[PDB]
Amino acid sequence: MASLTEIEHLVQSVCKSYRETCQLRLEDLLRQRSNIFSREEVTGYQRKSMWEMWERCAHHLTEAIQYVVEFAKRLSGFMELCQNDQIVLLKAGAMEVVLVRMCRAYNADNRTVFFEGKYGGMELFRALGCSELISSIFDFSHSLSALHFSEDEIALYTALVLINAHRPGLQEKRKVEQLQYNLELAFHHHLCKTHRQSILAKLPPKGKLRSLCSQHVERLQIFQHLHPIVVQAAFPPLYKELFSKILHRLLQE
Numbered sequence: 001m002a003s004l005t006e007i008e009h010l011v012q013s014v015c016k017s018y019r020e021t022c023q024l025r026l027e028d029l030l031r032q033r034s035n036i037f038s039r040e041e042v043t044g045y046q047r048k049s050m051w052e053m054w055e056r057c058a059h060h061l062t063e064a065i066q067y068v069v070e071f072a073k074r075l076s077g078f079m080e081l082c083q084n085d086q087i088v089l090l091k092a093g094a095m096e097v098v099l100v101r102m103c104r105a106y107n108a109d110n111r112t113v114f115f116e117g118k119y120g121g122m123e124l125f126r127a128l129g130c131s132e133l134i135s136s137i138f139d140f141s142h143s144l145s146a147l148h149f150s151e152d153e154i155a156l157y158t159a160l161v162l163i164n165a166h167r168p169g170l171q172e173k174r175k176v177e178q179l180q181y182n183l184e185l186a187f188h189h190h191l192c193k194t195h196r197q198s199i200l201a202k203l204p205p206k207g208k209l210r211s212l213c214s215q216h217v218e219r220l221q222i223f224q225h226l227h228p229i230v231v232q233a234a235f236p237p238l239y240k241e242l243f244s245k246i247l248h249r250l251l252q253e
């Protein structure tokens, strides 16, 4: 199945689907690099309440996930799978896709991320009280920066990150396995054509993405235990759905 032109068609279809669904153009993020939060501004974020910062972040993470749900809906063959499989893949892989995606909004020269209109270092998120999770995130973005990814590579890689046939709870495991193989051929083929297979060995292990997601849910349980009515009243429904319905309505569209 899938000949060389069908694989080359898949590549362009995945790359188009990601351009249509990335929250901000790479050019937009790159042009902002010199707009860094002032010392005073960082202190403002630091002085903010924990539950306020946590609301802000859950909100931003939900917007990011919403674009990943649209990227999945535009992925070739994803809408063909059953809703159970669609929701299983999105539940496990949505945070994961964002964790890879975020490298575009990171600056390895000054070690800063683009948050709320400006760039800022780790200390911006001090009030969250995650520390190990924030460092883990910042190291993960630093590690993907060393790869000097192209948009096409980030699109092909994230499609694979999402289309994982090993996710527990999949009903048609073979149907995921068929598409995951096709997407893998497209990724490797593109790498091969562009003389970029070198990156394959440097890519993060699957267990790195799993640890970051675990750290996320673990730190969320802790916060929720201290502030249950903040998570109840001020957290977005889709956030509580994936990390604590909406996905079915989001898929219908």
Ligand SMILES: CC(C)(O)CN1C(=O)[C@H](F)C[C@H]1C(=O)N1CC[C@@]2(S(=O)(=O)c3ccc(F)cc3)c3ccc(C(F)(C(F)(F)F)C(F)(F)F)cc3CC[C@@H]12
Binding pocket: 023, 024, 054, 056, 057, 058, 060, 061, 064, 098, 099, 101, 102, 103, 104, 105, 113, 114, 115, 125, 128, 130, 133, 134, 137, 138, 216, 220
């Ligand atoms: C500018 C733009 C589009 O928002 C940048 N982005 C992209 O390009 C990505 F695809 C998605 C988006 C993006 O970077 N992101 C979407 C929200 C944001 S962020 O920008 O708010 C942020 C960046 C770095 C960082 F250390 C902390 C927060 C976010 C929010 C919360 C968490 C947490 F895991 C936390 F770290 F706080 F513990 C959670 F959920 F538990 F709260 C993690 C992340 C990492 C991805 C980040």
